[PDB]
Amino acid sequence: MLFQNVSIAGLAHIDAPHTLTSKEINERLQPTYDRLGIKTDVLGDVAGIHARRLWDQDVQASDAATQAARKALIDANIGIEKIGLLINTSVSRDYLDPSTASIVSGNLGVSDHCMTFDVANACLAFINGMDIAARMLERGEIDYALVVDGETANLVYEKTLERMTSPDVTEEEFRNELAALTLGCGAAAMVMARSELVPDAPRYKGGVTRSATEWNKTRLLLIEGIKLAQKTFVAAKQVLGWAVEELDQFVIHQVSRPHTAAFVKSFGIDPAKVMTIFGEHGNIGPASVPIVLSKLKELGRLKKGDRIALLGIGSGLNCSMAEVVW
Amino acid sequence: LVPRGSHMLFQNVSIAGLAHIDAPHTLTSKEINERLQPTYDRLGIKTDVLGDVAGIHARRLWDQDVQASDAATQAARKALIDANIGIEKIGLLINTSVSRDYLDPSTASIVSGNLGVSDHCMTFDVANACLAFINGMDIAARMLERGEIDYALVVDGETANLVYEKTLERMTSPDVTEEEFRNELAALTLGCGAAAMVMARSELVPDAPRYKGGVTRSATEWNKLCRGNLDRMVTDTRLLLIEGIKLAQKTFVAAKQVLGWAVEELDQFVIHQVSRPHTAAFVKSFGIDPAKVMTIFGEHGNIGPASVPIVLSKLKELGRLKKGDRIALLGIGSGLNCSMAEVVW
């Protein structure tokens, strides 16, 4: 039932180059925090986000996804002409039409046999993209796929901070709104391939998904997310052999320190198997999972044989959990 | 005689149900042309570029408060009835529309929530201009062929109200330039509507139509040709035509190799339509018999990725499709991409 000939040939991430610290945000918000009499530092002390990155002026999602794609192709040591599928999984999109994938593909110079489209599914889309690509690889439709994701938050910061510091701003409009200030910029890309082409590479086994779409309608969400993850774990038991103590890394969506700590505590996971980047990068949406895996790889933390869980709880609510064997 | 492989076409995937929704408000080209007339005069335009050149006489609109997810959901409930199954049987729901309620969450999650899908139901959106329904069908077919689910919904609601209202305002400005006017005119060929399809493993619906899949080719060097956001679409229709037909020629070659296609052996061609002249050029350049090409563009316009399934649904409801018919699904989508797939009724 699991995928046996789907591999990860290459992976890369791009860290965005401008730093915006939560201290800096708080200096700009101080006058508003003071009217309103707010006195907790919600970003730094509660969410646990001390900084995030921002792109240069006028970097689009496509541009960031393109930069990641180029580095991933170098990591796989393959030319663009081998790519038969390019899936873009970002939340951020250049337009509604065409697909952001078509623009990234056009930038890269893919062949006329390359199928492209975008998948959107909040922070779980990269895992959905991987699974989609796996299915095509498995069937022999393509040899190599790129899954790419560039996330842009510059506009959301500009507009959100302009809003919040207006003289009319009510405190309701302030609170959920602060939430946008946990987002970050960044990009990732992965080349997947048929295993017989890349026999020493990590293998993607597949995964499971469960859903709680009765909540599409933000600490109920934390609680309801965990309940849904619990159900998703049960399915991961039955389809993948999962037990917590047998996994070497958990690569998880990163939303907040509290969200991460509650997850780790519910499941009795060793926190040392859970790398986090939100403290310096914030929440990079669906790119967070592959950015974390890529950091794990580049830091030499992944050994041959390691069992890696990729997962997230995404808006919807949805929860996906998949396995890679390094 | 000679053992041959499947060419990677889908095995044991069927279409269990299909439905469409027509949007309720007619907006005639005559009404649009009255609103545009002072601009036509200023720009020296003396031909009816909507009705006589593009060949669009009317389109349908929703109420302003209808979102893509609402339209899709309505189509989905109809498709479920067509398939005679309850929502609890659905293991995959994919939304394929260009229109979207939000960047996050997905439109599929909203539709799923409205329908009451089970907690086993996987959901996501796919975006790929006017070919996305077919992509969604392919993605679902891969799961169905492998036996991971029994039934899937593919859903698509399109809302063009905003683009109409804002385009018409921009185009009636005393200062709009000729170039802007021509860039935005194709927005006035869009229409509202919705479609949904329930796909199933063929063992469950033995008399249902079969979906085989098919072939795709691309020309993503042309990704700047058509660009759209929630209130504006700018299109180079001249190069979409020329470069579209070139890409399609290449994609017909692949279809001959993979699907066995010869145009004269297909019974129906369900085509995505940009305009009457684009459609006439495509049918002429490929030698397709015009009697095998159903058009709704005249009265409904270009419903984006919902066009193909809506036309398929209307053919089914007309009784034009009989058992054994070979049905080609074809489109050229912004990108550019071209997909060609086969249904056997």
Q: What gap in Å lies between CA B338 and CA B250, rounded to an integer?
A: 9
b/e sequence B34-44, b meaning 16+ C-beta within 10 Å: eebeebbeeee
- Minimal Cβ distance to B123: which of A112, A139, A213: A213
CA distance B309 to chain A (A): 19
Please state, in angstroms and as integers, the Cα–Cα distance from residue A69 to each residue in A96, B265, B332, following that order.
21, 42, 26
- Could you tell me the sign of the dihedral formed by the alpha carbons of B102, B103, B104, B106, in that order? positive
CA dihedral A119, A121, A124, A125 (to 10 degrees): 10
Do B1-205 and B206-345 fold alike per CATH? yes
Q: What gap in Å lies between CA B72 and CA B18, rounded to an integer?
A: 12
Backbone angles phi, psi at B164, to 5 degrees: -65, -50
- Under 8 Å between Cβ of A59 and A90: no
A97/B233 touch (CB, cutoff 8 Å), yes or no: yes
- Under 8 Å between Cβ of A195 and A7: yes
Q: Which residues from chain B sit within 8 angstroms of residue A110, using beta carbons?
A: 218, 220
Other Cβ atoms closer than 10 A to A277: 18
For residue B338, the SS3 value is: strand
- Under 8 Å between Cβ of A133 and A192: yes
The CATH topology of domain A1-198 is Peroxisomal Thiolase; Chain A, domain 1 (3.40.47)
Architecture of the domain delimited by B206-345 = 3-Layer(aba) Sandwich (3.40)
Cβ-Cβ contacts under 8 Å between A and B: the total is 164
**Which residues lie closer than 8 Å to A19 by C-beta, 6 or more apart?**
A51, A52, A53, A54
Q: What gap in Å lies between CA A213 and CA B118, rounded to an integer?
A: 9
B127/A120 touch (CB, cutoff 8 Å), yes or no: yes
- Minimal Cβ distance to B217: which of A97, A113, A316: A113
In this structure, the strands spanning B58-61 and B122-127 are unpaired
DSSP string, A65-106: HHHHHHHHHHHHT--GGGEEEEEE--S--S-SBS-HHHHHHH
Q: Please report which helix (H) or strand (E) contains residue B196, including its range.
A: strand B193-201
- Minimal Cβ distance to A210: which of B119, B229, B233: B119
Query: Exposure of B134 by Cβ count < 10 A (0-12 exposed, 13-18 middle, 19+ buried)?
Result: buried
Which residue of chain B has the CA closest to A215? B113
So what CATH class is A199-326?
alpha beta
Q: What gap in Å lies between CA A234 and CA A83, rounded to an integer?
A: 36
3-state secondary structure labels for all residues of B105-167: CCHHHHHHHHHCCCCCCEEEEEECHHHHHHHHHHHHHHHHHHCCCCEEEEEEEECCHHHHHHH
CA distance A289 to chain B (A): 17
- Minimal Cβ distance to B220: which of A106, A212, A285: A106
Between A61-76 and A100-108, two packed helices, what is the crossing angle to 10 degrees? 50
A96/B221 touch (CB, cutoff 8 Å), yes or no: no
| Of the candidates B127, B121, B76, the residue with the CA atom closest to the CA atom of residue B100 | B127
For residue B317, the SS3 value is: helix
Tokens of A124: 């779980």
Give start and end residues of each alpha helix (H) in chain A. Answer: 22-34, 61-76, 100-108, 125-139, 154-164, 171-174, 220-240, 257-267, 278-281, 288-298
- Minimal Cβ distance to B128: which of A117, A212, A318: A117
- Minimal Cβ distance to B223: which of A106, A115, A118: A106
In the PDB record, what is the listed experimental method? X-ray
Q: What gap in Å lies between CA B305 and CA B135, rounded to an integer?
A: 10
CA distance B318 to chain A (A): 32
Most distant CA atoms of chain A, gap in Å:
64
Which residue of chain A has the CA closest to B114? A214
CA distance A104 to chain B (A): 9
| Of the candidates B273, B194, B159, B155, the residue with the CA atom closest to the CA atom of residue B20 | B194
Q: What gap in Å lies between CA B56 and CA B291, rounded to an integer?
A: 19
**Which residues lie closer than 8 Å to A70 by C-beta, 6 or more apart?**
A108
A316/B120 touch (CB, cutoff 8 Å), yes or no: no
Q: What gap in Å lies between CA A131 and CA A123, rounded to an integer?
A: 14
In this structure, the strands spanning A51-54 and B58-61 are unpaired
| Domain at B1-205, CATH from 3.40.47.10, 3.40.50.12280, 3.40.50.2300, 3.90.1150.10 | 3.40.47.10
DSSP string, B21-86: EE-SEEEEHHHHHHHHHHHHHHHT--S-IIIIII---EEEE--TT--HHHHHHHHHHHHHHHHT--
Q: What gap in Å lies between CA B297 and CA B6, rounded to an integer?
A: 35
**Domain ranges within chain B, ordered by starting residue:** 1-205, 206-345
- Under 8 Å between Cβ of A15 and A281: yes
Q: Which residues from chain B sit within 8 angstroms of residue A141, using beta carbons?
A: 8
Tokens of A43: 């970003």
B123/A119 touch (CB, cutoff 8 Å), yes or no: no
